[PDB]
Every structure is written in structure tokens, then in C-alpha cells.
């Protein structure tokens, strides 16, 4: 991949009915961000992308889940409340369908591509870790 | 009547200097028409009253900055960026300097000039958004 | 009363079933801090008060309630998990028992003294305010 | 075996420099014999080991810190401050700098001396202490 691997999690233990708040300062100047979650790097719930400029998407939310390695189809939102080189916080509420909650205050539905009980594993790319809290 | 926020959280004592900052974590009151946070030295003496409206007098989504002096306001400052929903939570940081930021959470700040002399802040008040968290650095 | 005031919180709107978290800066070289919860300031349901030395007391919390200005019956608790000048944490669980979460993990149980629904107002006395967060 | 404890989380890429500090809360399983916050650039090569011990080998209610190289422990040294309750939440934070130093959630601090050079952490993992947050400062 072309963002630079920041913070990640293994062993996270997320199970359904529970969330996980992600603050961070998004890299100066970058084309895009991302906060991943899912059962290892290969197989993710949920990747929430948030792209300034890349490929066809300019200040758009990029949504995917990946399985085996493989992307699934992208889900694309236009709401974009981000600045590169700004703190941002992003909170995912983990359920059968997780709910990504923008720092605008809008709540991004992104239902559960594959089965998944547990959440063991987050990362975040191109973004400089503030703090990880899970409720 | 709703020409009036409710009145949530007032903290006093806030001891509040230069050259440190604010952040106020809350839940926006739903289907409210604005709602605001005050940082002065009282309720008449506000260095930054920051007044988000969703529908208020000739303001529709936008950011309405003041001061207010003696229980006077003074001129209203504008913003047109307005990452809020009424009902969600929300956060916003000021960095208190002779320049005060407002930092949005959409990651856009905006400068407000301290309008009068003040050293320290020590009053801050919440209106039609209810508390999660405050906290000073 | 002799110590500095620190903040004070009015309109808190603290109901049953929630709690308080107070994370603060004890002030350096002081004899006791205190943290107050109640309907105002004449009307406490909990004045939580670590002494590190006042009156009889040394190294011990007293807690106490207040009604119309008046202090009732002190409880004392051995247990002080406290350095005065160090950050601390006090979380305060509002019940028909409240229960005072001290940062060496032990759990204090304080008794509501009158009836009560909703904490309006908490205050802070010679500790320095670094948080405070509702849940 | 109750001799291991329990992985929790592991944090990679932290990049923690000197002059900063990590704060972790998290929950001690309940009923367990030490827990564990660990420091360093990977699990074989820790400058912190910080093992709170309610009951493990010679030690009753006390902190042991250590740290390793080339998976190999070097001298422990024990504290017998000890402001813990297996099954509750707790916070330590640690400052690094060339004596790092150990906030215990009591006022308390343990400094520990780097035992071998290093300019970031970037491995952070918890053992019998369930994640609440990690903050970076
Ligand atoms: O679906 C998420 C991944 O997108 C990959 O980029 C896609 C791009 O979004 C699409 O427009 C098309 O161009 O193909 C690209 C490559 O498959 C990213 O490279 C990846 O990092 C994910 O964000
Ligand atoms: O300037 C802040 C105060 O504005 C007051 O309303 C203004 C209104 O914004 C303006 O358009 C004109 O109608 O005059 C009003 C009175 O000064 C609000 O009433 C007050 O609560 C502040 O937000
Ligand atoms: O009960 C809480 C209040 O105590 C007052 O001090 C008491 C003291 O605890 C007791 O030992 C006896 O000496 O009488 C004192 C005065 O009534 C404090 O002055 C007050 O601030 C509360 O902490
Ligand atoms: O020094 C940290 C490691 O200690 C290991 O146990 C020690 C024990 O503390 C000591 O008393 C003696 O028994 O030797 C043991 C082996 O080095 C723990 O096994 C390990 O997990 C660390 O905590």
C-alpha cells in the first residue's frame, strides 16, 4: 500500500455492543487516511478511507471491507470533515451493521460484509495515533 | 421560549491562562434551532461566545463568534463551515492566546481576536448542548 | 472554610445510574483536597476529602454530606492512594449508594444521606482541574 | 499455564519518543495472580517491564520492573508501593526520557533507568489487564 502503517492493534477483543473512539492527527499534506478494522490485516470489517485526492475521489470517504486479502465493493460517502494536518476523531460502534460516526455528527451505516463476533485488530495509516478508547 | 438556549453546564474558576486550551466534548440538544459555548469571566463578560445556528434569526448553518462587554454584545463574526447535527455529540478546542482559536472538529480553526484585555479564563458555559467532558491543557 | 477554591460546576444534570470522573492536580504541599457533589453549594451529598494531615486525621478520607450548611456524621477510610503536587483520578457512581472509585482501585460506599435525583453541582478544593467526563 | 499470563493487547508502531508520555487504563482480570505493561521495540527487547505481582514467585503485593534484550531478563528491580485491586480499572503512565519514569495511579513514581540505548518505543503490550485506553501525550 502507498500510506505510511502507523499505530496497530492486535488482540483488541472488541466484541458487538461495544465502540472504539480514534483520535489522531492526520498526516500534513496527505492525499488520504485510513482507520482499519477487522480479525488481522488481511481480513477486514471495516476500512474507512478518507481520501483528499485519490484515484477518482476528491473529498470523499472511501468504505471497504477486505477478505483474504481481497477488497470487496467500495461504499462512498461525499460528507467530509476533515483537514490534512488536523486532529480528527472517528468512532466506530461495532454491531451487525457498525455505525462510523463522522466528527460532523453524521452516522455512516457499513453492515458487516462477513461474519465477525470479535474485532481483534486496528490500525491506522497516515494518521499519528492521540489516543485509543474502547466503551 | 426558544428564542432562549437552555441553560446546561456553567463551570467557574476555570483558571484558564494563555498559552493553554479548552476542550468541551457534548451532546448537541436534538431537533435544537443553535446552541453555544462561552468562555469569559462571567455571563456578562464573554472574550468568546461561539454560537453555531441551525436556523436562528438571519442564520442557517452557521457559525455566529461574539463578545460581549458589560452585558453588551459587540460585532458578530460569521463563519460559514458547520460540521455539527443537532442531537450528536460534538467537540470543540480553544487555544487561548491574544488570538483565541476555535478549533472545529471538522479540523478548521478560526481566529478570534481577544476584543478586550484578559488574562485568564475562568468562566465557561454550555447552552442547549448537554456535558460528556471537559478538559484543560 | 480554609482551603483554595477550585472549579465549580453548576447545572451538572448528574442522574441516577451515571457517574463522574474528576482527574486533577493536587495542589504541591497541601494538608487536604476535597471534591463535592450535591444540589449546591449549602446542600452536599458527598464531600469526599483525603487528609493529609487535618484535625485528628492523617493520611485518611473523611467523607461526609451537608444539609442546609450543616456538616452531618463523618466516615473515615484507612486507605490513601494520594501524593500531594501528583495528578489523581476520583470516579463517583451515582446510586441510592454512591460509590467512590479510588485510584488504588478500591470501591468506597457512601450512602446517600437525603433524597436525591440529580448532582447539579460538583466542586473542586485545592486540586487543580484536568478533567472531568460524564458516562 | 497461571504461571503465563493472559495476552491482551499488543501495540506496534507506536513511536514514542523521549520528552513524551503513554498513559494506559485498562482492567485487571479479576482474581489474577500480576498483570503487566510492557515497553520496548518488540517482546524480546523491553526497556520496561512494569509486573505488578498480587501473588507470583517470592513476591506478594509487589511491583516488579525489568527489562529484556535479545529475550533475556536483566536485574529486577521490586517496589512495594502497591495501589492495585485484581478485577478493578487502573492507569499507569509512562514519561520517556533517558530515566523513564513510572506514574503510579497513588502519586507515586518509579523512575527506571534505560538499560540499553533506545530513542523510540515502539512496542506496547498489556498481560492480564483488559484495554480501557491508551493516550499519547
Ligand atoms: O477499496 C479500498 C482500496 O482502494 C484501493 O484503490 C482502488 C481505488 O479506490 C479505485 O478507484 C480503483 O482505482 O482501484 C484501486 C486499487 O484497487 C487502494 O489502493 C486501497 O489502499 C484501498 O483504499
Ligand atoms: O451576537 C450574539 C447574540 O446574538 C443575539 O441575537 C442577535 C442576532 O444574531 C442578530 O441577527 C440580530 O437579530 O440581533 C440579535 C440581538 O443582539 C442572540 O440573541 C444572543 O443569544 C447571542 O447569540
Ligand atoms: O466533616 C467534614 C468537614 O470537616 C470539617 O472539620 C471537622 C473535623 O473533621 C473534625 O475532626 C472536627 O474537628 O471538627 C471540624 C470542624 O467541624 C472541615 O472544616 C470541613 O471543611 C469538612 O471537611
Ligand atoms: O523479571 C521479570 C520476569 O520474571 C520472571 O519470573 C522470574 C521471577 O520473578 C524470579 O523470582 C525468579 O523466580 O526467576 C523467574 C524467571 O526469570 C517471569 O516469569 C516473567 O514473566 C517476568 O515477569
Same mark, same amino acid.
Given at each position: 500500500?502507498?500510506?505510511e502503517p502507523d499505530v496497530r492493534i492486535t488482540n483488541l477483543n472488541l466484541h458487538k455492543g461495544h465502540?472504539?473512539?480514534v483520535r489522531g492527527r492526520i498526516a500534513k499534506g496527505t492525499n488520504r487516511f485510513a482507520v482499519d478494522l477487522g480479525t #488481522?490485516?488481511?481480513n477486514?470489517?471495516?476500512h474507512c478511507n478518507p481520501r483528499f485526492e485519490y484515484s477518482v475521489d476528491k473529498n470523499t470517504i472511501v468504505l471497504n471491507s477486505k477478505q483474504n486479502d481481497v477488497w470487496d465493493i467500495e461504499k462512498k460517502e461525499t460528507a467530509f470533515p476533515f483537514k490534512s494536518g488536523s486532529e480528527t476523531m472517528l468512532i466506530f460502534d461495532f454491531e #451487525?451493521?457498525?455505525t462510523v460516526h463522522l466528527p460532523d455528527g453524521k452516522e455512516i451505516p457499513f453492515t458487516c460484509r462477513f461474519p465477525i463476533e470479535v474485532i481483534n485488530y486496528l490500525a491506522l495509516n497516515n494518521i499519528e495515533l492521540i489516543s485509543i478508547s474502547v466503551h
Open positions: 500500500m502507498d500510506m465502540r472504539v473512539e #488481522d490485516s488481511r477486514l470489517i471495516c #451487525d451493521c457498525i
